[PDB]
A paper describes a structure:
The DNA damage response protein [name] (p53-binding protein 1) influences the cell cycle dependency of DNA double-strand break (DSB) repair pathway selection. The localization of [name] to chromatin also requires that it binds histone H4 di-methylated at K20 (H4K20me2) via a tandem Tudor domain (53BP1TT), while BRCA1-BARD1 recruitment requires unmethylated H4K20 recognized by an Ankyrin repeat domain in BARD1. We show that a series of water-soluble small molecules targeting the methyl-lysine binding cavity in 53BP1TT function by stabilizing a previously unknown lowly populated autoinhibited homodimeric state of 53BP1TT in which the histone binding surface of H4K20me2 is buried within the protomeric interface. Our work therefore identifies an auto-associated form of [name]—autoinhibited for chromatin binding—that can be stabilized by small molecule ligands encapsulated between two [name] protomers.
To test the possibility of a pre-existing 53BP1TT homodimer, we created a 53BP1TT mutant (53BP1TT-PN) in which E1549 and D1550 were replaced by a proline and an asparagine, respectively, to introduce a 3D structure-preserving β-turn in 53BP1TT. These mutations eliminate the six salt bridges at the 53BP1TT dimer interface but do not affect the small molecule-binding surface. We verified that the structural integrity of 53BP1TT-PN was preserved by determining a 2.20 Å resolution crystal structure of this protein variant. The backbone dynamic properties of wild-type 53BP1TT and 53BP1TT-PN were quite similar as shown using NMR relaxation measurements. As expected, 53BP1TT-PN also bound UNC1078. The most likely interpretation for the absence of interaction of 53BP1TT-PN with UNC2170, UNC2991 and UNC3474 is that these small molecules do not cause 53BP1TT dimerization directly. Instead, they only bind to and stabilize a pre-existing 53BP1TT homodimer population, shifting the equilibrium toward homodimer. When overlaid, the 1H-15N HSQC spectra of wild-type 53BP1TT and 53BP1TT-PN showed small chemical shift changes that map to the inter-53BP1TT interface in 53BP1TT-UNC3474. This is further evidence for a preexisting small population of 53BP1TT homodimer that is eliminated in 53BP1TT-PN. We showed that 53BP1TT constructs engineered to prevent auto-association—while preserving the ligand binding cage—have no affinity for the small molecule ligands, and yet, they bind H4KC20me2 and p53K382me2 like wild-type 53BP1TT.
Author numbering: 1482 to 1603
The structure:
């Protein structure tokens, strides 16, 4: 039904790793899989059920923000904005909000499962 998923930004995980990372679909490789180019440069084929077609990550989503002191901490998306073409998320934690670059925001398995119903490609 869909014209094409190529070029769409997503957050996706591979198997045996429980986090979703931001990336983009570069190719429909069939077999229910898509070639995903992660923002860090890593590229591999991922199952449709492991892809959340949401960009930006919606507001009021509980996410995992990579934080100072190599600290991964759960927080809630309260805003996003483009800064010279780059997407930044406003994440609320301990009742305070801070800006994080796109790549510093990931989803744990539980956090991503909450979005599968609405945004998953399963």
């Amino acid at each position: 039904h869909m014209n094409s998923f190529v070029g769409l930004r997503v957050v996706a995980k591979w198997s045996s790793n429980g986090y979703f990372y931001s990336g983009k679909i570069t190719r429909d490789v069939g077999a229910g899989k898509y070639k995903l180019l992660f923002d860090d440069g890593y590229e591999c084929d991922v199952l449709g059920k492991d892809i959340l077609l949401c960009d930006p990550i919606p507001l009021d989503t509980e996410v995992t923000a990579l934080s100072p002191n190599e600290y991964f901490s759960a927080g809630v998306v309260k805003g996003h904005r483009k800064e010279s073409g780059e997407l930044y998320y406003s994440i609320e934690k301990e009742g305070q909000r801070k800006w994080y670059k796109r790549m510093a925001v990931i989803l744990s398995l539980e956090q991503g499962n909450r979005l599968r119903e609405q945004y998953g490609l399963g």
